[PDB]
């Protein structure tokens, strides 16, 4: 018998999440037969990767950051690498892939196709990782994703003292205040210390309230990845209670995707905004360029997982459920998203595909599950 | 001794507006003391144009609808005419020119560059016209702008019976319901009966609440202009009392521009939305494609006039006043507009220009006044 209310105890909620996740795993694996149980892939918590497993994933990402970019130079002058190709299409489409009916599915297809690049162009044969925020909400610096060792996605940014607070503005609502974290400078430890962020900033929120924005964020702007790990943000938005809340208290797709992303004006940024802004720095604090932070892919692995859990809890009603339009917060107004709506990743990978073919992890081009 | 509170009598409010406009005229001509009294242009009510002067203007617009487009085909494949060049750039920039700090200035520059094309490519030597909404709020079908004669911008459209209401949505707020007008179909008469609208639809609101959106609204879609004149929209949002309230109750530029465009959630679409949607039809009900309705230019003449009046009531504080950001309703968040923000019209006409050179009708490229 599944839980129905999220516990306020962290240990309790974590066990509730396991139960629901196991429920969804059972639902997926039982119904599967192109995708079969025999060729079904499994995505796992970063913490369950062995040291060699972690290093194989990291090395494949590094490979992508070394290979020439496919995007025609005249459409994205700043692109240099295959990794940049994914950042550039995200930047290019930010205003029709967040707070839209396509947000969840687009990102599902996005990370799938990023995974395909690792496998087909960088000889990656491991499992797709996800970052379970709940386990790190008490100390982000100790997260295996961000501890700075050679099995992490590099570490914190170097310490910059006396940083003012972050002030997140959307529309005309009052700013959401956030502390600035423990870093702020370049990330100079771990396997990405030599990584060059090449695109943006498009809309970079800064300590103190300012926002930096390039004239054209697709032009060349080589610089260091910065971070300022902010545990306090995870403590507010990404604890195991908040994760289970999101799954159990959302009765339709609208409430789920909006609770996940944060209801504008509500004071909360959800698990999705909480994971992003907990990284801090650059592009961590830039909704357009966020894939430029290597932890993006683990973050959205967990996003896709929580959606997949929520879907499988009431499959018949939820698998193909869509709500919202084709424009950011429906500004300007645009038609409702439908199963016939087509999305694409530009020159990053793959091709145009209908929403219809993205709603199940065991259908269309998808054949995977979460453990 | 100027009015300070708007009157509810349409007769008194009309005289109040006349006093405020006459004050603004005095202020501007006094300021003019390369803009001089000897070269200052006067923009005038369409109702003040003689029959010959009206036909002179219409014929120049028709000339622009026959001259070949400048836009590179690969950027706007549906463009055919110089008129299309203006429609195309508006479509392309709609999301950064409405509910932005640049809204008022951008449209001032837009209609001036349209005037440039009339004067330099179609031999126009007359005055720029404006549509005084308040004088037609009692019956739009008798408006000299919309009466369907050879001195109108064409008139009403073919009858469509038993139409549903227009339902205007923005972000989350409940719909503003508008009646669907006394027409519906292609214009039946007047100078633009055979005029072909080539771009869009991009986001065309329809009777009953649906919206039509082309996959790419910059590709070729030749069709008639449709109209459904809606006097009740003018009665609700564009009477002389509503015009005077906008001017006299707005104590800063944020409030002025937002009251003009309609505050989301307020139930009102302001004089700006009222003028647009009162035309009904296609592209009248399409925020991206609206310059495709030939009355657009007279509508935005009045918009600019009302801004000019408001500026001249306190020039020291209002001449150069700006508020807002570079994105529609600041979704997603973007930096504040400043006097150094640059706007441009693509290939429609002219070069890039900074906000600081747009704030006065008697500075920068501008040397005109309203009577
Ligand atoms: C709609 O708005 C977009 C964004 O402002 C406009 O995009 C701009 O288009 C031009 C022309 O394609 C791009 O520029 C230059 O062309 C030369 C080759 O002649 C190339 O070598 C340069 O690198 C550059 O691409 C420009 O970069 C591009 N800007 C952005 C931000 O993408 C578009 O032209 C507008 N469409 C219409 C119909 O006005
Ligand atoms: C950003 O998105 C736009 C729209 O999807 C892309 O524009 C297409 O670009 C190709 C190649 O220049 C054109 O043939 C199409 O006509 C364009 N479509 C539209 C609707 O304009 C653009 O290429 C994307 N840029 C990147 C870097 O992905
Ligand atoms: C999943 O299936 C196993 C049997 O294969 C069962 O023991 C377990 O209780 C199931 N989990 C849930 C949450 O139903
Ligand atoms: C914010 O930007 C302004 C200029 O717009 C600058 O003067 C100020 O120092 C900046 N504030 C911080 C905290 O960096
Ligand atoms: C925009 O201007 C307001 C003042 O009206 C200021 O408080 C805010 O910080 C500015 N926004 C940014 C992103 O700097
Ligand atoms: C405008 O100036 C004229 C001429 O000086 C004057 O007669 C009139 O009263 C003025 N109008 C206003 C509203 O100040
Ligand atoms: C969008 O869907 C809602 C129901 O979720 C519907 O009421 C509305 O009319 C739709 N919008 C359009 C523009 O058709
Ligand atoms: C509105 O759109 C829906 C969805 O396509 C359609 O079923 C309905 O018939 C449309 N109504 C009108 C009046 O066009
Ligand atoms: C367990 O720990 C979480 C943080 O991970 C708290 O938010 C919760 O209230 C409980 O103390
Ligand atoms: C209108 O009223 C004002 C009051 O200040 C006078 O200054 C002016 O002469 C006119 O009578
Ligand atoms: C203003 O408008 C009202 C009706 O809207 C009339 O009663 C008045 O005479 C003036 O035309
Ligand atoms: Cu995204
Ligand atoms: Cu994200
Ligand atoms: Cu406009
Ligand atoms: Cu307008």
Numbering used by the authors:
A (entry chain D), B (entry chain A): 5 to 37, 46 to 383
Give passages from the manuscript.
Two new crystal structures, called met/deoxy (an average of met -and deoxy-forms) and deoxy, were solved at 1.8- and 2.5-Å resolutions, respectively. In this triclinic crystal form, the citrate ion forms crystal contacts between molecules A and B, resulting in symmetry with two homodimers in the asymmetric unit. In the met/deoxy structure, the copper sites of the A, B and D molecules were refined with one water molecule between CuA and CuB. In met/deoxy, one water molecule is refined between the copper ions in molecules A, B and D, but the distances from copper to water are relatively long (2.3–2.4 Å), and therefore it is not a typical met-form. The copper centre does not represent a fully reduced deoxy-form either because a clear electron density for one water molecule is obtained. The copper site has features of both met- and deoxy-forms and from this perspective, the copper centre is named as met/deoxy. In molecule C, a peroxide ion was refined between the copper ions. The Cu-Cu distances were 4.3, 4.4, 4.4 and 4.5 Å for molecules A, B, C and D, respectively. However, some signs of oxy-form are obtained at least in molecule C. We believe that met/deoxy structure is only partly reduced, and it represents predominantly a mixture of met- and deoxy-forms. Interestingly, the signs of general radiation damage, such as partial disulphide bond breakage, were only observed in the met/deoxy structure, probably due to the higher resolution.
Coupled binuclear copper (CBC) proteins contain a type-3 copper site that reversibly binds dioxygen. Tyrosinase catalyses o-hydroxylation of monophenols to o-diphenols (mono-oxygenase activity) and the subsequent oxidation of o-diphenols to the corresponding o-quinones (diphenolase activity). Catechol oxidase only catalyses the latter reaction, and o-aminophenol oxidase catalyses oxidation of o-aminophenols to o-quinoneimines in the grixazone biosynthetic pathway. The overall structure of AoCO4 shows a four-helix bundle around the copper-binding site, as seen in all CBC proteins. In AoCO4, His102, His110, His119 and His284, His288 and His312 are responsible for CuA and CuB binding, respectively.
